[PDB]
C-alpha cells in the first residue's frame, strides 16, 4: 500500500537531495533509496504546480487509485512543512526517448520487436487512463520522455503532474500538442491520441519530433513523414538501425495507426482502445515473422 514519509525520511533517502534527475510539472525529481533498498524517483514541490493541502489531497487520492502494469505506480508521498513530495519507483532503463536518440542509443539500438512491445504497453497504459472508472483521466503531456522502461524493457507511462480528470496558455510539449487546442481551448482524450501518434513516429523513425539542425524539409517529424506514409513509401522514414528487422505488414499497420492518430481534427482519430487492438494484431504479425 501507499506509504506516508516524513520530510526527514526523504532527506536521508535522497542524501540532501544530492542527485537530480530532471524537472517536471510537479517540480524537480531526485534519485533516492528507501530503507528496504528500493531505488526511487523523488518528485518535490514546484511553486507554480502547487497550492495547498486540500488540492494535493485529491491529486493524491487519484494517483493512489491508478494501478496498471503499464503505468508507473505511486509508492508514497510527503506533505510536511509546506513541502509536497511524490515518490515513484526508479525505472532503471530510463525513458523511451533516451533509448531512441539519447545517450544509450549511441551505445546500442532498440530493435523493432522491443519497440513494438513498448508502443503496445504505452498504449495500454493510456487506454487504462482514458477508461478509468468514474472519470476518464487525460494525461495531457504524452511524449517519449514520459514513457519509462523497467528492467525487462516493459513500458510504463509516467508523470501525471499535468494529468487530470476529463485558460488558454502554453500546454503539452513542443511537437506533441493537439493542433486544434488553440481553437477548442480544451485538451481531451483525442488530444492525448494525437501526442501518442507522434510517439509512434518517433518509435518508427528514431527521430525527435522537432530538429532545426536537420534540413528545413525535415525540421518537423510529422510534416516530414506524413507524405511518405500517404505515398506508400514507408521505408523512407524507418529508422536505419531497424531497417530489415521488421515484418512489412506489422510496420505498415503501425504507421497507418500513427497517421490516424495525427489527423488534424479530433473526431477522426481512433480511441486508445482501438489503437491497442491494432497494435496487438501488429505484434502478433511481427512475432510470426518466423
Structural domains in the chain? 3-89 (3.30.200.20), 96-287 (1.10.510.10)
Which positions make up the binding site for ATP?
43
Task: Give the residue numbers annotated as catalytic, written as ranges.
Answer: 141
Distance, in Å, from the CA atom of 95 to the CA atom of 4, rounded to the nearest integer, reads: 27
Method in brief: X-ray
Dist CA 96 CA 119 (whole Å): 10
Distance, in Å, from the CA atom of 94 to the CA atom of 90, rounded to the nearest integer, reads 9
- Separation CA 152–CA 185 (nearest Å): 39
List, in order, residues 6 or more apart from 237 with CB less than 8 Å away. 201, 204, 205, 224, 225, 228, 229, 255
Match 510539449 to its residue by C-alpha cell.
173
Rounded Cα distance, 116 and 275, in Å: 12
d(CA 105, CA 37): 29
Q: What is the DSSP letter of 69?
A: T
State the number of CA atoms in the 13 A half-sphere of 129 facing the CB.
32
Evaluate whether 224 touches 163 at the Cβ level (below 8 Å): no
- Give the resolution to one decimal, in Å: 2.0
CB 77 within 8 A of CB 5: yes
Pick from 93, 102, 73, 69: nearest CA to 149: 93
Amino acid at each position: 500500500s501507499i506509504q506516508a514519509f516524513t520530510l526527514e525520511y526523504i532527506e536521508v533517502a535522497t542524501e540532501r537531495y544530492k542527485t537530480l534527475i530532471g524537472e517536471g510539472g510537479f517540480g524537480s525529481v531526485y534519485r533516492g533509496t528507501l530503507n528496504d533498498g528500493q531505488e526511487v524517483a523523488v518528485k518535490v514541490r514546484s511553486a507554480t504546480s502547487t497550492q495547498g493541502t486540500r488540492e494535493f489531497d485529491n491529486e493524491l487520492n487519484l494517483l493512489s487509485a491508478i494501478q496498471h502494469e503499464n503505468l508507473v505506480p505511486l509508492l508514497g508521498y510527503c506533505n510536511e512543512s509546506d513541502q509536497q513530495i511524490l515518490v515513484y519507483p526508479f525505472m532503471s532503463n530510463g525513458s523511451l526517448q533516451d533509448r531512441l536518440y539519447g545517450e544509450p542509443a549511441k551505445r546500442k539500438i532498440l530493435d523493432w520487436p522491443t519497440r513494438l512491445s513498448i508502443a503496445l504497453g504505452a498504449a495500454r497504459g493510456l487506454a487504462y487512463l482514458h477508461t478509468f472508472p468514474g472519470r476518464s483521466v487525460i494525461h495531457r503531456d504524452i511524449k517519449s520522455s514520459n514513457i519509462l522502461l523497467d528492467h525487462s524493457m516493459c513500458a510504463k507511462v509516467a508523470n501525471f503532474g499535468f494529468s487530470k480528470y476529463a485558460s488558454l496558455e502554453v500546454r503539452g510539449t513542443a511537437g506533441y500538442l493537439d493542433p486544434e487546442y488553440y481553437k477548442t481551448q480544451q485538451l481531451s482524450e483525442k488530444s492525448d491520441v494525437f501526442s501518442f501518434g507522434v510517439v509512434l513516429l518517433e518509435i518508427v523513425s528514431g527521430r525527435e519530433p522537432l530538429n532545426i539542425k536537420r534540413p528545413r524539409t525535415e525540421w518537423s517529424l510529422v510534416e516530414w513523414a506524413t507524405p511518405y506514409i500517404r505515398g506508400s513509401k514507408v521505408d523512407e522514414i524507418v529508422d536505419p538501425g531497424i531497417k530489415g528487422g521488421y515484418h512489412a505488414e506489422a510496420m505498415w499497420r503501425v504507421v497507418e495507426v500513427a497517421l490516424q492518430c495525427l489527423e488534424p481534427f479530433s473526431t477522426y482519430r481512433p480511441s486508445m482502445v482501438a489503437i491497442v487492438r491494432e497494435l496487438e494484431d501488429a505484434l502478433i504479425i511481427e512475432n510470426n515473422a518466423s
